[PDB]
Every structure is written in C-alpha cells, then in structure tokens.
Design a protein around this ligand. Structure first.
Ligand SMILES: *[C@@H]1O[C@H](CO)[C@@H](O)[C@H](O)[C@H]1NC(C)=O
Ligand SMILES: O=C([O-])C(=O)[O-]
Ligand SMILES: [Cu+2]
Ligand SMILES: [Cu+2]
Length: 691
C-alpha cells in the first residue's frame, strides 16, 4: 500500500490544512481522492512533482515559466477561471494601484515607494518591471535587474528578494525577523492582498496587483473610491476602468503536471468533480475557492469560478503567449541583445534538407536571417507562436491554421503570370494570380476519369495543403458527405496521416525505408514533386499536384534518376466534366484555383520581415544580384525547399493582410467544413489560447 490519489503539493501549513479538509470531503462524497505533500515553496512543489512526490500544484504565470524549464518541464493541465459564470475568463489584468490625492503617472515613479506581490510574479514583478525597463538605466547582465530596481524606487516590499543583497527591496516588508520579506504568509505584505495592504497602510505609493484585489478587499464602494489606476498612457482612471487601464492582460494561474507520466486524466477528473461538489457556493462543508479568515488564496485563487482544461498541445511557452513568454526571457537580457533579436529574422525550416538551405542562406544574410527547424509545419507554426522562430512560407491550407492562431500573411510567392511581362521587373506589385490544382494520370489509363477516380490509389502532396488535399477531398466530401477520408481511395500516399492507415499505404519513407509517411522532404513521395513521382512510378493512379509540376518534372526538366525519361505526353489531366486533356490545357482542365503560398509571421515582426525579405531577394531572388553566382533562394531544383522553385519573387498583399482576406470566403468556408470531420491538436490549442 501507499495511496491511489492525486498528490497535491501544498506550499504552506494553512495550505496543507485545507488540502486535508479537501481530502476529507472528497472521501465523504465518495469522489476522486487527493493526498497532500508539503513544501515551503513553489520551487520545492516544482521539484517534488518532477521527482514524483506530488502530482500537481497551481502556479502563477511566473512559476509556469520556471516550471517549464528543464530539468522540470512541467505542463499546465487546467487553468483557473475568473470573472463570472457568464463572463468567465482565463486571463487577468496586471494593474498599478494608487490612492487618489496625488498626480504622478507611470513615468514618474522613480524614487517612489512600491508594493509588489512577490519576486517573479506576473502582476507583482514580470509585468511592471518590464514596463519600467526604459527608466531603470539597467546595464544588463551580469547585474541583476534587481539592483537596477532597488536604485530606481526608494524602498519597496518585494517578497522573496535577497534581503542581503537588495536590502532596499525588502525595505517596506512588514514581516518580523527572518520573516521580513519572505515569499509566504509570514510576510503580511505578500501576494495580492499583502501588496494592497502595503499601499493601504501608506507604506508604498503604488501597488502592483490584479484588477480584482481592491474589489475583493474593500467591501464598501466609497472605500474603493480612495484609489485609482495608473494607466500606461500616463493617465489616471478608476479602479473599474481596468479593461482600458492595465499594464497587461496575462494568462490565469494553472495547475501544472509532468509532461511525461503526468496523470492529467486523474487531475482533470478530481478537479471537475471537486468544482461540481465543492465549487462556487455549493457546499458549506468545504469550499475549494474560499479561505479561512486567517488566509488568502489557499491552493487556488479565492473566488476563481472553476477550471478550464488545457488542450494537450500546450506547453508553458504556448500557455504564456509570445508576448509574456518573451517578456520574461528579456528580463535576463541586455537591451542590445533584445534589440538584436528583434532585428533578426529566424526562419523555420521543416526537415533537414530545408534546414541545410536555410544555413546556406543564413551565412550569406550578413546576420539578418537565422535558422530554426521542426519536423512538421505545425511544429514550426508552434515555434513562431512561442516567438522562438519568426517566419516560414506556407501552403494556403496552413495559412488558415496559422491564421486561426493569430499569425498574419506578410508577402506571397508570385509565380509566372497569366503573362503580364517577361522576367518581370514589377513582380513585387504584380498582384498574385493563384495556382491551378489538377489531378494527373498516366496517358495510357484511357479509362480513368474524375467520376471513376474514387476507389483507385491516390498520391497527395500532404494532408492539409490545397492542391494535394483540401481541393480533391473537399470536392469528394461535397458529394458523399462522408468524413471517412480513408475510404475515398483504396490506398494512398498522403504524408501526415496515420502510418497505419490506408492513407500511408503507398508511402516510401527515405532512401532507407524510414520516415514513411512523414510530412517533410524525408518521405520520397512528399510535396508536389513527390506526389508526382508516386504516379510516375505506378505507385498511385492519380496525383493531386499543380499543373507546373509535370512540366518541371518531365522532358529532362528534372533528370533525377526516377525523372530522367518521363515525357510530358504520357500524362493527362482529369477534368471535372469527365473529359481528359493534355497538361498544357490545365487552364481549362483544373479542379480549382489555389491561393498562392504566403510567408506568415507574428504581427510584431511584419515590417522588419518585409524589409529583410525585399533586400534578400534583391540579392538572391530570380534575376537576383548573387544568383546563381552565389545563391538562389528560389531554387532547390525540383524540391521546393523553403519556397517553390517557381517563385518569380515575394509580392506585396494589396491589403489582404488577414488570412481571411488573403484566402477568401469560399476558401475559408470550405476548410471550415472539412475541419469538423476532425480538428488538429494545433487548432484545439489556439481555439483555447484565443478565447
Ligand atoms: C536613467 O538615466 C537618465 C539619464 O540619461 C536619468 O535621468 C535617470 O535618473 C536614470 N535612472 C535611474 C536612476 O532610474
Ligand atoms: O498545394 C499543395 O498541395 C502543396 O502546397 O503541397
Ligand atoms: Cu498571479
Ligand atoms: Cu500548395
């Protein structure tokens, strides 16, 4: 014997106590069971959990950060919900409270006295210190920002600060003895309520807390009136103007568990039942979101209204946000190092071949481009959200996903026009024309037509790209109305599907029979060239590609082994009408017009990304000053690494700077429908992070 429960990590006595009561009432209702572990702080809870001696603990975004780092790598599993029942939210506001009577704004705090919730806390430290960075005159590492803050304000209360080294910072703490400035209840000016008390008692001039404290601690309304908020536009507004007067909107506290053998189920079952039974006003036996007249926020935030489960794709950095995550990292960086990182463009390369070319581009960018890599597009989009990568060129199917995630289209791949000019000097403002999606078959299969394609073997670029999957499956879906995308064709090579499905049946992995059905250039049947090879080698009977693919790959246009003897004349296109036409008539024989591949980024990098890309292609583009002498960005010769080998240039968007404006209504309308049949972990993660 041992236990059978979820072991909660208490970080204090009054917390072990309530944990205990929580344990009792779980039993006494025959609900899921919680056992309790004891520690003196959040980090100890972090390590206990990582060594398996507690299962979970609810932490402040500052400790979510900390906890994600190796060697811990804990993951947020359930977020606290605040606001109300019908105006519930998984975020809170970092505000700056002051008393009415003075007139000093957020830019005039030097030499004032401040009250903070705790060292490394979202609203008490990370946000305000980051907001005042520009007035601290901090020289950067190795002098801790602390020393810069200790010099900036006169005296402060900042629980957990090193009293030895940053005496000024513990200055205002009320604790008696070795308790003065503790990161615990011993220290009365601790957490939100202590920080507020600090201000209320007249000890500090500003309190750095959440929007709710004043309303939780001050009953009377007119009591509340003695205070006001310090807004970031150096204006003062009432404590109720938080939505229009906050330093930041940050993620709510969250329960973190191990990323490995986590017990997320358990934790989620326990939490769910507990909030049913013991939640917001509904069981005087026990109250999961209330604390003894002693206490404040024991185990969970007082007055949270419940839990919201975190989609399994979310890690600390996606939980935290590009914004907040980066802001925490920056606190440990010189401002030159921070300014260099913003000037630099970090490319996300999908697989090894693309990383190779990126390295090559990198060494020649004169430090303006650097590389990052993932093994799928979704992993690359997850690195750009985390701010660890910045850009990649994507298929319109990916433009939608990135877009539901908050990324915007910056420049689009411009291909040879419906002919406007020749080696076109205005390829940059020339509006994009789209690409044609076509179904290619062997000329000799005289019998094969659009209406007899179903049930045969197919070859697709990858799951979720326009020509290779949204178009063909969309068109099919629209007739049958079946979500069983694996019965449309009997055997396929659709990279990114279950390696065990029929949809991976014809894939061949790399040169060695590995990487079977992976959605990166590791699989030989991947992307446009690879969907085509699949056909040219009688693996499949149809290949969903773009017209240009066959030209580029037959008639010695490609002389890779497999391509060498193919002749354009052995292939034909299936038209919707039941006909068949030669490849040269794709203009009047296509499934549909696909939106151009586009490079996407975070909104914060748009302008610098534009700058960089216009300059780099000027040098390495099509009739680029260094190409082919030195480097051609738009050539990997039939492999389309980073960009399509046929990009004439990167063109402006002509105001379609939204995935919806860029993709168009029919288009969004259609991936939406297809997406119901099944969503991805990644749209599930952003659905959550958007809210
Ligand atoms: C920041 O630097 C400026 C001078 O260039 C100065 O006015 C200010 O006092 C400095 N910093 C502190 C102590 O916050
Ligand atoms: O459109 C497609 O199929 C692609 O870009 O792979
Ligand atoms: Cu907090
Ligand atoms: Cu495409």
């Amino acid at each position: 014997g041992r236990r059978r429960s979820v072991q909660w990590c208490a970080v204090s006595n009054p917390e072990a106590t309530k944990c205990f009561q929580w344990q009792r009432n779980m039993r006494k209702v025959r609900g899921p069971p919680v056992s309790c572990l004891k520690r003196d702080s959040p980090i100890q809870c972090i390590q206990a959990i990582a060594e398996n001696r507690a299962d979970a603990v609810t932490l402040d975004g500052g400790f979510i950060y900390e906890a994600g780092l190796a060697p811990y790598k804990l993951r947020p599993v359930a977020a606290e919900v605040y606001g109300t029942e019908r105006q519930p939210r998984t975020h809170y506001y970092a505000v700056a409270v002051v008393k009415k009577g003075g007139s000093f704004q957020l830019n005039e705090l030097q030499g004032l006295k401040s009250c903070h919730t705790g060292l490394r806390r979202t609203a008490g430290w990370n946000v305000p210190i980051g907001t005042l960075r520009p007035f601290l005159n901090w020289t950067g590492p190795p002098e801790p920002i602390e020393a810069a803050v200790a010099r900036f304000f006169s005296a402060s209360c900042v629980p957990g600060a090193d009293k030895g080294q940053f005496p000024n910072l513990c200055r205002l703490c009320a604790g008696t003895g070795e308790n003065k400035c503790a990161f615990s209840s011993q220290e009365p000016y601790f957490s939100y309520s202590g920080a507020f008390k600090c201000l209320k008692d007249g000890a500090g001039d500003v309190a750095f807390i959440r929007e709710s404290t004043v309303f939780e601690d001050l009953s009377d309304e007119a009591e509340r009136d003695e205070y006001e908020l310090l807004c970031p536009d150096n204006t003062r507004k009432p404590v109720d103007k938080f939505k229009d007067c906050h330093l930041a909107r940050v993620p709510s506290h969250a329960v973190v568990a191990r990323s490995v053998n986590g017990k997320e189920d358990a934790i989620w079952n326990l939490l769910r039942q507990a909030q049913e039974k013991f939640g917001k006003d509904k069981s005087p036996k026990f109250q999961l979101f209330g604390s003894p007249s002693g206490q404040k926020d024991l185990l969970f935030k007082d007055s949270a209204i419940g839990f919201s489960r975190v989609p399994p794709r979310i890690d600390s950095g996606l939980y935290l946000g590009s914004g907040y995550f980066t802001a925490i990292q920056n606190l440990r960086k010189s401002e030159e190092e921070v300014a260099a990182r913003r000037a630099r463009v970090v490319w996300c390369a999908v697989g090894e071949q693309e990383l190779r070319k990126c390295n090559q581009w990198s060494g020649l960018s004169e430090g303006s481009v650097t590389c990052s890599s993932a093994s799928t597009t979704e992993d690359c989009i997850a690195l750009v959200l985390k701010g660890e990568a910045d850009a990649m060129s994507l298929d319109g199917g990916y433009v939608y996903t990135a877009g539901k995630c908050g990324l915007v289209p910056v420049l689009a791949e411009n291909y040879k026009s419906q002919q406007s000019s020749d080696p076109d000097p205005n390829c940059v403002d020339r509006p994009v024309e789209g690409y044609l999606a076509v179904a290619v078959v062997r000329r000799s299969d005289t019998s094969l037509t659009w209406n007899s394609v179903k049930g045969k073997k197919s070859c697709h670029t990858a799951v979720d790209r326009t020509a290779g999957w949204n178009i063909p499956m969309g068109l099919l879906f629209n007739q049958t109305g079946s979500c069983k995308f694996d019965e449309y064709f009997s055997q396929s090579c659709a990279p990114g599907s279950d390696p065990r499905s029929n949809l991976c049946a014809l894939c061949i992995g790399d040169e060695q029979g590995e990487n079977k059905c992976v959605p990166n250039s590791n699989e030989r049947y991947y992307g446009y060239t690879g969907a085509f090879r699949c056909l040219a080698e009688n693996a499949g009977d149809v290949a969903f590609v773009k017209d240009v693919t066959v030209l580029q790959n037959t008639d010695g246009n490609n002389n890779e082994a497999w391509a060498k003897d193919l002749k354009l004349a052995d292939f034909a296109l299936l038209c919707l009408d039941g006909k068949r036409k030669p490849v040269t008539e794709a203009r009047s024989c296509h499934l549909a017009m696909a939106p151009n591949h586009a490079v996407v980024s975070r909104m914060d990098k748009v302008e610098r990304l534009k700058q960089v890309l216009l300059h780099q292609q000027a040098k390495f583009g099509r009739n680029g000053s260094d190409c082919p002498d030195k480097f051609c960005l738009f050539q990997s010769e039939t492999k389309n690494l980073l960009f399509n080998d046929n990009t004439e240039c990167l063109a402006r968007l002509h105001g379609k700077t939204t995935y919806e404006k860029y993709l168009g209504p029919q288009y969004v309308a259609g991936i939406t429908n297809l997406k119901k049949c099944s969503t991805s972990p990644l749209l599930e993660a952003c659905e959550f992070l958007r809210k």
